Write a protein that binds this DNA or RNA. Structure first.
Length: 274
RNA sequence: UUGUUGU
């Protein structure tokens, strides 16, 4: 058994509700280049943007099925070099909507292709990667909504709930029921495993930081954060002080921090390096 | 509209 440094959060915001700064269901969280916190407020049909200190900035998306209208947004990603926000809509829309940094509509696509989007992210070539649970599929789009890659992996995925990529076309997916992160390439080849049972049980998300370290997040008792090299060599392991409710999503921030979206309708900002 | 686990 491995020894974990203790970690605590230094910021916390949000509460149940329907007004600014309030959440019905904070299903997805993403961080942009100025470390704003973008939240998918699913049952409120809106995306909410805060600064790195939980301060509400603005919001966009009203109920509906046409342009400039979100129904059930569950996950978000950010195009870092543009500020654009990538939104995935749950059933019955099952599609992707792209908004700019100002919350204005750009385009939407993928409704005839997506079914169960459970994680989304963007690579350095601007390509959008989506992972789907229940059916176990990875689909990769360009910014214009053209499908570039599609592959199933029901043989290798039990419960995919998060995704990031590096600069080498490798895809890192957290598998909640495999208790690890599984690595694939864009062609669908199953490369390797990072983490495992006993060290990263029931992961709830995965991240990659500026050092190119793979962070696996779980909530199997405390809120645990296990940090690996891209090979799977263990670097660092941490556990929180508090115990949390169910957790939706995690997102990394510039200065060695993680945003943790909880069932208790509050986002918690942990720091994993002093 | 919604597959985490921690009875």
């Amino acid at each position: 058994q491995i020894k974990r440094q203790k970690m605590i959060y230094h910021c916390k915001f949000g509460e149940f509700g329907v007004m600014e700064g309030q959440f019905t269901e904070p299903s997805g969280v993403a961080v942009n280049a100025q470390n704003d916190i973008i939240v998918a407020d699913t049952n409120n049909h809106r995306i909410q943007i805060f600064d790195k200190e939980g301060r509400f900035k603005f919001q966009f998306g009203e109920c509906g099925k046409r342009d400039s209208q979100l129904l059930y947004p569950n996950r978000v990603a950010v195009v870092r070099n543009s500020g654009d926000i990538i939104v995935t809509e749950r059933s019955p829309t099952h599609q992707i909507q792209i908004y700019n940094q100002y919350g204005q509509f750009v385009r939407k696509f993928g409704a005839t292709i997506l079914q169960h989007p459970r994680g989304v992210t963007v690579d350095n070539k601007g390509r959008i990667i989506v992972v789907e649970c229940k059916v176990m599929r990875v689909i990769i789009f360009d910014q214009n909504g053209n499908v570039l890659h599609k592959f199933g992996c029901s043989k290798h995925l039990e419960f995919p709930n998060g995704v990031v990529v590096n600069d080498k076309q490798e895809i890192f997916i957290s598998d909640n029921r495999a208790h690890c992160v599984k690595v694939f390439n864009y062609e669908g080849q199953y490369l390797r495993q990072i983490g495992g049972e006993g060290i990263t049980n029931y992961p709830i998300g995965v991240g990659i930081n500026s050092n190119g370290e793979i962070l696996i997040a779980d909530n199997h008792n405390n809120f645990n954060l296990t940090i690996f090299t891209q090979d799977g060599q263990l670097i660092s392991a941490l556990e929180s002080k508090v115990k949390h409710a169910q957790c939706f999503d995690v997102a990394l921030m510039d200065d060695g921090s993680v945003v943790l979206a909880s069932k208790d309708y509050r986002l918690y900002i942990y720091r994993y390096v002093q």
